[PDB]
Amino acid sequence: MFENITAAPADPILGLADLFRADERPGKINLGIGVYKDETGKTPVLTSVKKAEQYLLENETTKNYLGIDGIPEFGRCTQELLFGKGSALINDKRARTAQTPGGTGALRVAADFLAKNTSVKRVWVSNPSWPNHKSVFNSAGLEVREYAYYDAENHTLDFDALINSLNEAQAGDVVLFHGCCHNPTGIDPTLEQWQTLAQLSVEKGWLPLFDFAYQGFARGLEEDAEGLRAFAAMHKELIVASSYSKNFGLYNERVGACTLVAADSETVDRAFSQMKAAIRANYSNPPAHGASVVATILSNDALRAIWEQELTDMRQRIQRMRQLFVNTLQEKGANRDFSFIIKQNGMFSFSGLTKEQVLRLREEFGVYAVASGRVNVAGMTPDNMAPLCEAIVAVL
Amino acid sequence: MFENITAAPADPILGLADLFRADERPGKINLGIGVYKDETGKTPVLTSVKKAEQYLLENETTKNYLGIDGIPEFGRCTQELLFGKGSALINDKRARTAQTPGGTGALRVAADFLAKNTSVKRVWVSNPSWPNHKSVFNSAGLEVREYAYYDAENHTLDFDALINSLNEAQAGDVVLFHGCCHNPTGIDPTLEQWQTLAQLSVEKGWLPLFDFAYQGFARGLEEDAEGLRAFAAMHKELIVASSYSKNFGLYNERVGACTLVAADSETVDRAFSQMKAAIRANYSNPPAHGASVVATILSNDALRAIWEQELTDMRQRIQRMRQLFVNTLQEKGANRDFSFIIKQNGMFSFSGLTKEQVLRLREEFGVYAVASGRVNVAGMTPDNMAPLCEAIVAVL
Ligand SMILES: Cc1ncc(COP(=O)(O)O)c(CNc2csc(C(=O)O)c2)c1O
Numbered sequence: 026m027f028e029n030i031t032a033a034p035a036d037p038i039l040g041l042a043d044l045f046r047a048d049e050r051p052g053k054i055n056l057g058i059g060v061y062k063d064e065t066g067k068t069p070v071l072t073s074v075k076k077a078e079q080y081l082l083e084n085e086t087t088k089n090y091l092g093i094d095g096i097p098e099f100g101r102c103t104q105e106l107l108f109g110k111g112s113a114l115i116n117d118k119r120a121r122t123a124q125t126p127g128g129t130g131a132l133r134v135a136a137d138f139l140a141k142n143t144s145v146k147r148v149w150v151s152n153p154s155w156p157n158h159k160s161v162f163n164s165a166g167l168e169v170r171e172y173a174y175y176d177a178e179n180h181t182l183d184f185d186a187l188i189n190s191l192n193e194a195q196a197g198d199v200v201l202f203h204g205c206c207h208n209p210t211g212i213d214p215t216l217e218q219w220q221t222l223a224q225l226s227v228e229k230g231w232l233p234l235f236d237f238a239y240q241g242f243a244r245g246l247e248e249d250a251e252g253l254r255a256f257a258a259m260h261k262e263l264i265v266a267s268s269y270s271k272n273f274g275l276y277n278e279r280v281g282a283c284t285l286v287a288a289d290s291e292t293v294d295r296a297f298s299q300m301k302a303a304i305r306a307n308y309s310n311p312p313a314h315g316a317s318v319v320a321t322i323l324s325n326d327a328l329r330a331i332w333e334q335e336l337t338d339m340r341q342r343i344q345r346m347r348q349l350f351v352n353t354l355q356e357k358g359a360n361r362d363f364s365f366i367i368k369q370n371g372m373f374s375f376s377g378l379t380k381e382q383v384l385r386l387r388e389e390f391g392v393y394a395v396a397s398g399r400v401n402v403a404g405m406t407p408d409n410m411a412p413l414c415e416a417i418v419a420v421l
Numbered sequence: 422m423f424e425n426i427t428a429a430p431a432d433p434i435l436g437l438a439d440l441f442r443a444d445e446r447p448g449k450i451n452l453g454i455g456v457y458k459d460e461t462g463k464t465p466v467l468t469s470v471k472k473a474e475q476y477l478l479e480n481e482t483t484k485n486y487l488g489i490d491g492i493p494e495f496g497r498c499t500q501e502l503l504f505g506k507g508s509a510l511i512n513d514k515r516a517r518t519a520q521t522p523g524g525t526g527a528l529r530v531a532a533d534f535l536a537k538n539t540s541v542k543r544v545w546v547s548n549p550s551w552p553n554h555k556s557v558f559n560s561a562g563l564e565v566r567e568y569a570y571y572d573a574e575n576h577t578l579d580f581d582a583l584i585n586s587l588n589e590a591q592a593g594d595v596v597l598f599h600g601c602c603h604n605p606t607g608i609d610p611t612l613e614q615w616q617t618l619a620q621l622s623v624e625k626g627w628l629p630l631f632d633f634a635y636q637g638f639a640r641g642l643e644e645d646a647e648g649l650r651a652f653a654a655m656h657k658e659l660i661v662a663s664s665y666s667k668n669f670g671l672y673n674e675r676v677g678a679c680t681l682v683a684a685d686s687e688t689v690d691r692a693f694s695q696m697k698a699a700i701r702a703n704y705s706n707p708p709a710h711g712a713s714v715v716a717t718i719l720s721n722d723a724l725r726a727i728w729e730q731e732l733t734d735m736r737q738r739i740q741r742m743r744q745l746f747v748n749t750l751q752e753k754g755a756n757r758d759f760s761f762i763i764k765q766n767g768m769f770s771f772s773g774l775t776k777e778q779v780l781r782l783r784e785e786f787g788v789y790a791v792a793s794g795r796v797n798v799a800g801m802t803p804d805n806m807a808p809l810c811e812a813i814v815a816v817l
């Protein structure tokens with residue numbers, strides 16, 4: 026049965042990772058990492074999370090299965106984060122949330138739900154996007170089409186090209202939007218651009234699918250949800266796949282949410298019954314530990330305040346690195362405009378380097394980024410900035 | 422998009438659960454539960470698990486993502502449990518294990534892997550089985566066909582009927598076997614019957630899929646793997662979906678494994694690359710907490726000994742309840758042979774009651790089982806046995 030199976034395309038993440046590992050050189054630098062790192066180059070467990078985990082160890086009396094949609098408090102806190110306390114969406118009971126194994130799990134549950142229960146055949150994704158989007162939707166039998174996004178000349182959102190591309194989208198197609206901190210570009214629509222897109226989506230009959238993996242990493246929790254909320258104000262229906270992997274530092278505990286919104290409570294409950302069926306046939310019910318940590322923190326004033334500050338600290342360190350990168354490149358004699366880096370949001374940006382410059386950086390200088398030239402600004406520290414920038418200047 | 426969606430068939434588990442909840446009566450009894458309960462009617466966190474969780478709280482320094490296939494130690498310990506220390510399968514590097522979100526996750530990963538990478542179109546499942554098997558395989562686009570299993574007259578394995586049914590299975594079909602503690606019947610093949618099935622499967626070209634959710638609950642860890650090991654001795658290829666939900670009491674942490682076996686290391690590695698692709702497009706990588714608890718326990722002599730005894734205690738309490746049930750039914754004047762209950766393995770048995778007797782038990786006596794008459798023997802206690810049995814006698 027297995028003798029003729031073709032190997033999966035080689036894992037570029039493992040990577041990357043393996044080549045970085047094997048590199049004998051000082052002072053090698055990894056900007057290809059997917060996770061947040063602090064100023065010491067570590068990805069520690071958040072203090073709020075450790076406190077929550079201690080509480081759970083002390084207080085949990087069973088590991089009995091959660092419901093298919095997971096911890097109710099988790100769902101409520103999630104909806105509040107997404108839509109705002111006192112949202113009409115929430116008051117009108119138009120939203121249902123399933124706790125899922127990560128944002129990826131939320132995307133797959135959405136995909137399976139759509140493939141099995143609706144006429145959706147096609148999902149529109151930005152060019153570029155997170156490479157796993159295509160894999161996830163294709164796995165559910167959905168076609169993926171790309172829309173223009175990145176102005177490679179100006180390092181900005183090519184809004185005209187985006188709108189032009191999306192004209193080929195038919196009524197009943199899904200359009201995927203990154204809520205904030207677009208991956209890989211860090212380029213997000215302005216609020217006005219979100220409002221234009223929201224209006225257009227209603228007119229064209231698109232089903233919006235928001236992917237929210239970085240809430241809090243651009244400007245702040247509420248500010249980062251403005252785009253979603255602009256859509257939510259205009260649409261009867263949408264889906265949000267969110268993740269707590271980066272903003273709680275809970276990567277390996279697999280904590281995310283799939284939130285379904287419909288015109289009213291009867292309709293969302295009916296649709297959600299099929300989303301739960303989709304979950305039941307996949308992993309049955311979701312993993313408690315990470316989601317319980319999130320619910321414990323979000324629902325406690327003390328823990329929530331500690332967590333919010335920890336998230337603020339991450340957001341701010343990333344901003345400081347964006348600034349330090351631009352200043353240091355100028356001071357190492359780059360003699361080119363990198364100001365776009367200051368304006369971009371979240372851990373990721375395109376450096377504007379070509380695939381060959383990126384390969385050169387890896388081979389000659391032991392500086393590691395992904396082929397598109399995307400770099401994780403959180404892999405940067407005050408200590409590694411000067412060598413990093415000297416290497417980049419050298420390949421310009 | 423959502424206005425015309427048909428509701429999923431009503432959840433019979435929630436159930437059941439809700440009706441039991443709402444019942445005003447003493448002394449209501451729930452034999453429809455899916456989990457183990459102790460003599461006090463609780464499903465506590467195992468002491469070995471609490472000790473492991475304390476260790477992890479103390480020692481974990483990151484929540485950085487696991488690899489797609491999860492914790493390496495977990496995979497190694499899993500393979501040892503399944504195949505035995507010093508298994509040729511292990512020595513020859515013929516097996517690869519992905520840590521998954523529960524046994525259900527392992528079954529879905531197997532299903533997706535098979536649907537996408539092989540000519541498999543059909544999975545053979547016992548009549549009866551766990552109702553979610555059909556849902557999981559159908560979700561991946563695989564047809565499910567049933568084979569005869571339960572001799573409703575004799576409360577035994579209808580081996581002749583089983584073999585006859587499975588003659589309709591074509592070469593290249595998957596045949597699902599419950600490793601031990603068949604759900605719902607508690608009726609398992611004898612070792613000789615397993616050996617006959619292993620020979621037949623080779624001859625007919627079936628791909629065996631073992632579902633192992635109850636290792637340790639029949640006779641013991643090694644004894645319960647005899648069937649699997651008989652197949653493993655005969656086959657180049659097989660898949661095992663295992664779960665640690667019941668034997669570690671880790672239900673809600675979603676801890677299982679999908680183990681792929683092929684003729685040699687080159688072939689299994691190549692095939693496993695596509696199993697990892699299947700995982701990546703589903704939930705990306707698996708939840709650490711539960712699997713880390715399992716790996717911590719299994720790989721430490723002290724914790725493993727505590728856990729093994731806890732599992733033994735569960736196994737033995739279930740056996741004592743099977744015995745007490747049969748004795749108490751006789752002493753309440755049932756006047757019918759229930760000896761089959763003593764011989765059956767694990768938490769579940771068919772009582773031999775009809776769907777209407779089961780409904781009567783619920784409505785008139787507040788005793789709750791599933792419609793097929795399956796009962797969870799672990800819902801039985803010395804304290805509730807007499808009323809339970811008086812109710813059953815009353816509906817005979
Ligand atoms: C756009 C987008 N969508 C979904 C996800 C899924 O988050 P989790 O599955 O980790 O919760 C993520 C985060 N997962 C991720 C891990 S490394 C990475 C990267 O681009 O380097 C991304 C994301 O960036």
Ligand SMILES: Cc1ncc(COP(=O)(O)O)c(CNc2csc(C(=O)O)c2)c1O
Nearest residue numbers: 309455523524525551604632634664666677
């Ligand atoms: C035959 C079989 N296959 C797979 C599973 C999956 O185990 P987890 O997904 O819970 O790890 C299980 C256990 N899941 C389960 C929860 S309640 C239940 C029942 O029949 O009542 C079964 C099983 O009995």
